[PDB]
Structure 1
Amino acid sequence: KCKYSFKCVNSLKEDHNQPLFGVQFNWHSKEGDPLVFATVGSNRVTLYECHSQGEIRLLQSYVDADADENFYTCAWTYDSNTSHPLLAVAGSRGIIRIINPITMQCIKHYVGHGNAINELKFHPRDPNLLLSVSKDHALRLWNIQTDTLVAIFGGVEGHRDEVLSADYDLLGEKIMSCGMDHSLKLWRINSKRMMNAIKESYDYNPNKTNRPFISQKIHFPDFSTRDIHRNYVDCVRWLGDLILSKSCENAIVCWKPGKMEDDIDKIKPSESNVTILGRFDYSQCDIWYMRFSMDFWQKMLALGNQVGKLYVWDLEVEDPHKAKCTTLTHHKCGAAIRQTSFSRDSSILIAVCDDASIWRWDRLR
């Protein structure tokens, strides 16, 4: 048996009855402050608090003025200067909105992607750098302090189809992206070119020059493979220097570029080998856009499937690809679980569903 046990303590359904596509705990809150997570779906962004006796306390909602916006994803950050939390959301309109979670009002917004945005990620060491991933086949790195587009990752050897997912490594030196073209691509952002681009993006003063700020066009990833999956890749995360990624073949694959002994930071762009370490098998999760998540210290891996089962794997264990997961089911939870989120201390796991239901699972302590 997996050593991580959870009990379902609460559930609720949102009034709009549309699929909830994203859920994110805020990992930037004080160990003293209450645990807060956001859900997104329809034209709605909703905040909830977790409290004693399994309560899920509704805090506040944001409804977009555009009735036909469809939010797919959200990401937390904080303002460098005020230390106050900020929430980025985006979806089918390709517009990035920054919401003030205290007032739940839109502060500013970025247009630019020519199509839907499927994922948002904030740099783990610079909270002002937001990465967006788009159906126009590109990734974009924004500086939301100076409202500038730093770089566009796409072109000659960028993705050939819609990009679905991306993730920064531990320190934010590199990005792995993936999408409908079956490929996984690595983009290093600690190169001198990207370092200078990031620095220039901070020095940009509009009321001090008339020349617009030109984004760096990054056309060549630092590594690319289509040898991991045989179909689209709808989720990728770094596991240390290893990569976890999934397609619609009912497995998360753990792999790394190069040969097994090869250091990630010496992989050249022309590297043709990958090493598959193993896979996490499951069933009934072969529909498009089902995301997996890990806890802060990457001791646990969670994936929901299309009939409401929630798998949790212990990542600390020997022979982890052959170990049985914990399967969490509730007889009232039958809809597809789109994304899950662990609280900062791994005490809570929240799942959100295609029928607008939210499920709260508490780790037995």
Structure 2
Amino acid sequence: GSCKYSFKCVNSLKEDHNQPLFGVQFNWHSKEGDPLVFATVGSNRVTLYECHSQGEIRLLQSYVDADADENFYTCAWTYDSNTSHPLLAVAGSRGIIRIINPITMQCIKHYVGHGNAINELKFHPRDPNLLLSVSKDHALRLWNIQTDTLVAIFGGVEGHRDEVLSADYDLLGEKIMSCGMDHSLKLWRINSKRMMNAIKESYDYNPNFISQKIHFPDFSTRDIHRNYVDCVRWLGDLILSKSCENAIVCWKPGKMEDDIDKIKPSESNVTILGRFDYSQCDIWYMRFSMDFWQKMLALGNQVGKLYVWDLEVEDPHKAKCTTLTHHKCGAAIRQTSFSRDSSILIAVCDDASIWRWDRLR
């Protein structure tokens, strides 16, 4: 039946470059009482905004890459444990990771390892120094940004056979699920003793380091989608993933009864629980999102419509979303982001516009 979350559009902005904005991330690390700030990435630009009452969106900071042919695709927030400074990582076509310190307004760290473009960046949910990058070069990479070392390279003989498009840690940060253009979804456990020893020795390194080459994932499947898989996220111990077939598939490794932590790498079974159906999202690199509490699912389509599903109902795959639409919003929505308290939902588009949707209570 009807979904319970309702939103009102209270503002819409437009950046002066008129190039597609691919990514948008709210800073979930801000303390209670500080204003909600989010970042957008598109073209060779990084922009930071501050949300206020009555739909007001204050523009705080903007950055340009010296390289005009740089094209940022994604970003991810984190913090410095020693200095309590928020940090923002950005990356894109040139395959270079940049860490920007909005407090000092400097760019503090560059990482230039990958063989090609970076498609997604994700920070470990328990260790703010461990940064995961998925790339066009068929591999994933786990960086320690406090020691400036590369902990592991997730790829090789049984890794992805084409571009890696997305990945996501589980809630407690024990395992990673990746996907890409080889139709596959692969599981990499980072709570194995090899990985656990690699992380700590990466912390113990000081110059007078070799990274751990993980060839075999702890699970793999091509049997969820029939095309490229361009976005994956964990839903507890189940998986949400999507392709160009106008559906988000909710599945789990193995048969219905199987524990995620006892799935052996040999597992040839998967179980489809259901599909979140929608329409007009068949172009590539359109990413869905969830709020912190993983109670809402948001996805934009290629003609400016914004779908929000309630994830807490008994049959989320059988319940209607609420479509958020505006007469002046017609450009493809590349990514959305909820504030930590789910009060605000921001959507960025291919025409460099920004749309603020405020939850009605």
Alpha-carbon displacement from aligned partner over 1:155-180 (angstroms, at most 9, x marks no partner): 00000000000000011100000000
TM-fit CA distance, 1:105: 2.4
Write the deviation string for residues 39-59 of structure 1: whole angstroms up to 9, x where unpaired.
000100000000011101100
> 1:83-119 deviations in whole A, cap 9, x for unaligned?
1100000000000000011243211100010100000
Partners of 2:26 and 2:36 within 8 A in 1: yes
In structure 2, what is the equivalent of residue 284 of structure 1?
A: 280
Q: Give the secondary-structure state (helix, strand or coil) at the position aligned to 1:124.
A: coil
C-alpha contact 2:287 2:299 (8 A) present in aligned 1: yes
Question: How far off its partner does 1:80 sit?
Answer: 1.5
- The 5 A counterparts of 1:60-139 are 60-139=61-140
CA contact (8 A) 1:168 1:175 kept: yes
Does the Cα contact within 8 Å between 1:248 and 1:285 map onto a contact in 2? yes
Query: What is the distance in 1 between the residues matched to 2:193 and 2:4?
Result: 44
CA distance in 2, matches of 1:314, 1:40: 27
- Residue 265 of structure 1: SS of its match in structure 2? helix
Distance in 2 (CA, whole Å) between partners of 1:105 and 1:17 is: 25
Deviations 1:10-55 (A, max 9, x none): 0010001100000000000011111000000010000000001110
1: distance between equivalents of 2:186 and 2:303? Answer: 31
Contact 1:62 1:104 in 2 (8 A): no
CA distance in 1 between counterparts of 2:310 and 2:294 reads 9
CA distance in 1, matches of 2:360, 2:172: 31
Q: Give the Cα separation in 2 of the matches to 1:56 and 1:110.
A: 32
Q: Decide whether the 8 Å contact of 2:309 with 2:322 is kept in 1.
A: yes
Asked if 2 retains the 8 angstrom alpha-carbon contact of 1:121 and 1:132, the reply is yes
**Cα displacement (A) at 1:253:** 0.2
Runs of 4+ in 1 over 4 A off after TM superposition: none
Post-superposition shift, 1:320? Answer: 1.2
- TM-score scaled by length of structure 2: 0.99
Tell me, yes or no, if the aligned pair for 1:243 and 1:256 is still in contact at 8 Å.
Answer: yes
Counting aligned pairs with the same residue, the percent is: 100
Deviation at 1:197, TM superposition (A): 0.4
- Cα distance between partner residues in 2 of 1:29 and 1:42: 26
Contact persistence 1:62–1:105 (CA under 8 A): no
Deviations along 1:158-212, one digit per CA (max 9) or x if unpaired, are: 0000000000001110000000000000000010100000000000001xxxxxx
- In structure 2, the residue corresponding to 1:193 is in which secondary structure? helix
How far does residue 248 in structure 1 lie from its aligned partner after superposition? 0.2
> Helix, strand or coil: the match of 1:27?
coil
RMSD: 0.5
TM-score (norm 1): 0.98
With 75-84 and 351-360 compared, the bigger mean Cα shift is at: 75-84
Query: Which SS does the other structure have where 2:354 is aligned?
Result: strand
Deviations 1:242-286 (A, max 9, x none): 000000000000000001111000000000000000000000000
SS of 1:262's equivalent?
A: coil
Give the Cα–Cα distance (whole angstroms) in 2 for the partners of residues 18 and 109 of structure 1: 24
Judge conservation of contact 2:23–2:42 (CA < 8 Å) in 1: yes
Shift of 1:126: 0.3
- For 1:78 and 1:276, the matched residues in 2 are separated by 37
Supply the distance in 2 between the matched residues of 1:120 and 1:137 (Cα, whole angstroms).
Answer: 15
Look up the match of 1:58: 59
CA contact (8 A) 1:6 1:362 kept: yes
Structure 2 distance, partners of 1:104, 1:227, is 46
Deviation string for 1:94-152 (max 9, x for gaps)? Answer: 00000011243211100010100000000000000000000000000000000000000
Contact residue 162 and residue 179 of structure 1 kept, 8 A = yes
Equivalent residue of 1:28, what SS? coil
On the 8 A contact 1:175/1:186 being kept in 2, the answer is yes
